[PDB]
């Protein structure tokens, strides 16, 4: 047998593979399984077993579907595909990894350009990749290493040397962590100017004559005139340095000193509360500055330690809603936040409402169908009530709009529809195992019309009476909601409803339950029936 079959009949490959297959999201299992596979190929070469190489590519690519933000493994899968020889697949792995991060990542752009340098060999296109990298990641606080790459490529390839000045003048205004280095390059590269015509490298001719009073066409003794010119340009650089030093020292001292973790780890890692607080404040600072490249970069840069939380998926969505006025942008942010975050309830709530504002109701129907399908057409039985209740509100909006009303005065039947009322009754029938009983009753009360009040009274109030469910009968909120259903009927007159509540409803409750029911029922009575407050107190003592 070959090295592949010796690998596939190993005892360890069964357990490592099988632990990954049991626990897909835990990632120490994926890393042990992958390290073992790669190590059992003693030397990776162009002649190692093609079944074994196909097994390696399947392992890394499935891990990069499960955990799309691991930057270092996109780089490692690209370098492995380089060593095997085909630089085209390694191009596609770097571009796939850049795509996972919406183009906005410094490590992947830095490594993709250090790679690209060797293998492009077409100069206009190699430089167009640096001009693409610079618009997405160029304003990063740690982006000095990118600009070193761009400047060394310019200084080797270009013959003219105007492009170096034109790039370095832009770099002079970015508040980078290593901003001084490029000020020192500009100062040395000014200091080596050896005549007047070189000063047209720096800026334009007219700006020198008008703003700084330097004439390049000055014919005369040109020595001291040049020393005066260099003194003036060193002063204008001093003021620009002073601005950028204020920016950089402010950003470092408040915010960037405080963040310690800059990279995605695994869906099971926690972040300290300090870093959550300074990421929230640092995003607020960035949004104030109003540089949109830099706000998008800083949200993407902030999703790395805390992709799986959801406070920044919500926050980035809100910034797109109200500060940029963009709802399709915010839908795409929240929709992508479903993939990452573990909580998902606040995102689904806000995404339902973003879709409803975007007038795309069929997508809302599909998300409601996927949430009822995810619980096996049985959302009524979910332990966590917030899923069921948000589902049910937006499903009711779709349902009132979809089926015309059955009751008078165009009173849209919300929970009184045979599809929805069966879910509500099926959750009411579990009585203590489920969580959200009083909220569900308390929203069923709100109909206020004679036809609607009669249906709600007969189906949930009379029926839980006659079944004798002790949970609902001992509970004060049940009786309070029933009295409040009848009392706010616009149909019944005052004597009718007071007659009904005191004479029909209040005898029905048992006297053993008085110690449980009388706190709430008194609170109804004093609020609306001060006159009958003796009767109640007499009925239960």
């Amino acid at each position: 047998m070959d090295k592949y079959t010796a690998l596939i009949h190993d005892e360890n490959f069964s357990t490592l593979t099988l632990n990954v297959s049991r626990y897909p999201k835990s990632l120490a299992y994926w890393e042990k399984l992958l390290n073992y596979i790669v190590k059992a190929s003693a030397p990776i070469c162009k002649s190692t077993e093609p079944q074994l190489l196909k097994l390696i590519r399947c392992t890394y690519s499935s891990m990069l579907n499960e955990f799309p933000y691991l930057e270092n493994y996109y780089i490692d899968f690209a370098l492995l595909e380089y060593k095997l020889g085909n630089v085209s697949m390694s191009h596609k792995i770097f571009q796939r990894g850049l795509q996972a991060f919406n183009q906005r990542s410094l490590l992947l752009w830095t490594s993709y350009l250090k790679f690209c340098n060797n293998v492009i060999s077409h100069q206009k296109q190699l430089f167009k990749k640096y001009e693409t990298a610079e618009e997405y990641v160029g304003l990063h606080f740690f982006s000095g290493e990118f600009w070193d790459l761009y400047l060394e490529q310019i200084s080797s390839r270009c013959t003219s040397s105007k492009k170096y000045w034109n790039v370095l003048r832009k770099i002079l205004e970015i508040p980078l962590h290593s901003f001084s280095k490029f000020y020192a390059l500009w100062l040395q590269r000014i200091d080596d100017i050896m005549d007047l015509k070189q000063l047209s490298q720096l800026t334009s001719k007219d700006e020198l004559l008008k703003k700084l009073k330097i004439d390049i066409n000055y014919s005369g003794r040109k020595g001291p005139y040049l020393q005066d010119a260099k003194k003036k340009l060193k002063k204008i650089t001093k003021e620009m340095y002073m601005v950028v030093q204020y920016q950089v020292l402010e950003i470092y001292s408040i915010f960037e000193s405080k963040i310690y973790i800059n990279y995605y780890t695994s869906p099971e890692t926690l972040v300290s509360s300090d870093e959550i607080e300074t990421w929230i404040k640092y995003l607020d600072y960035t949004i104030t500055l109003q540089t949109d490249s830099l706000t998008h970069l800083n949200f993407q840069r902030a999703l790395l330690p805390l992709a799986h939380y959801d406070l920044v998926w919500i926050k980035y969505s809100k910034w797109l809603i109200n500060s940029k006025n963009d709802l399709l942008g915010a839908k795409n942010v929240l929709l992508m936040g479903l993939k990452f975050s573990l909580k998902k309830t606040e995102i689904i709530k806000l995404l339902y409402s973003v879709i409803c504002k975007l007038n795309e109701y069929v997508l809302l129907r599909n998300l409601l169908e996927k949430i009822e399908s995810s619980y096996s057409d049985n959302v009524e039985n979910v332990d966590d009530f917030e899923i069921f209740w948000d589902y049910l509100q937006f499903k009711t909006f779709c349902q009132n709009s979809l089926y015309s009303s059955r009751y008078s005065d165009s009173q849209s039947n919300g929970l009184l529809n045979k599809e929805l009322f069966d879910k509500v009754w099926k959750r009411l029938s579990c009585k203590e195992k489920k969580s959200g009983q009083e909220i569900l009753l308390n929203n069923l009360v709100q109909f206020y019309s004679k036809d609607t009040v009669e249906f709600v009274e007969k189906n949930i109030f009379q029926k839980i009476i006659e079944f004798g469910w002790e949970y609902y009968l001992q509970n004060g909120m049940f009786w309070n909601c029933y009295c409040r259903l009848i009392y706010f009927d616009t149909s019944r007159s005052y004597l009718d409803k007071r007659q009904y509540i005191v004479r029909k409803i209040w005898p029905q409750i048992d006297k053993k339950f008085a110690q449980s029911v009388l706190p709430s029922l008194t609170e109804f009575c004093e609020s609306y029936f001060p006159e009958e407050m003796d009767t109640l107190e007499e009925m239960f003592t």
């Binding site: 949109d292 940029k324 399709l328 942008g329 929709l335 996927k370």
Partner: protein, 232 residues
């Protein structure tokens, strides 16, 4: 006036070379219906005038990709107006059942995609944060139809496209299906988070002491903050 033949002639009249077709021109509009039948009826009534080469419909197997190739500036107005008003009138005014008349109170809202390599040098706004990898998404908001016809003319009068591949449409289909498949899988993972797919048992023995000492730091901070505040 809310009739699209009248607006279409109105915009044929006055828009400075609205008949001429844009070179290299590709618009993809993905739409969803809950009735296949009435939508196919609309596409028949549409294809009687749109023509087979310029406008195509590809059903994914409900989602239908509506693709415009080589369209005139005038032609895009007609197609997007009919389809966006149909997509709206299914909910708003279901009884009327006329295709070329947009009933009052309908504001046209939707999105379309263009290829990424267009250069543009209001009511149609391009979106930040677009999910599809090689395409640009545009959103149209609250247009009467008279306003939407005008705004599409001022939009495709400016924009200018370049050199897309022959099978760019298959690529859009594949990428769109991948993103909605990913979010469907994300919703199926909603019940399964605790221990269905996570190794909860080994996690808890690793973060039990950490949350315990974090809890002790919080209670010690509460006592320390009372001792800072109170005068005694």
């Amino acid at each position: 006036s809310f009739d699209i033949w009248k607006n279409l002639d109105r915009i044929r009249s006055t828009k400075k070379n609205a008949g001429q077709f844009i070179k290299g021109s590709l618009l993809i509009l993905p739409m969803r219906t809950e009735d296949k039948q009435q939508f196919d009826e609309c596409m028949d009534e549409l294809h009687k005038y749109i023509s087979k080469d310029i406008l195509r419909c590809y059903p994914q197997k409900m989602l239908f990709y509506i693709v415009l190739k080589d369209f005139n500036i005038l032609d895009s107005c007609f197609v997007l107006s009919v389809l966006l008003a149909f997509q709206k009138r299914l909910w708003m005014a279901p009884s009327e059942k006329s295709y070329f008349r947009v009933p009052k109170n309908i504001n046209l809202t939707g999105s379309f995609y263009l290829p990424k390599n267009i250069e543009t040098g209001s009511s149609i706004v391009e979106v930040g944060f677009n999910v599809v990898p090689d395409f640009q998404q545009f959103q149209v908001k609250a247009c009467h139809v008279s306003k939407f016809m005008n705004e599409l003319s001022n939009f495709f009068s400016q924009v200018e496209f370049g050199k897309c591949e022959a099978n760019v449409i298959n690529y859009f289909k594949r990428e769109y299906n991948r993103t909605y498949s990913q979010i469907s899988l994300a919703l199926y993972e909603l019940p399964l988070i605790g221990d269905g797919l996570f190794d909860i048992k080994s996690y808890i023995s690793k973060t039990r002491p950490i949350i315990e000492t974090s809890k002790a730091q919080m209670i010690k901070h509460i006592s320390e903050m009372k001792a800072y505040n109170e005068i005694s």
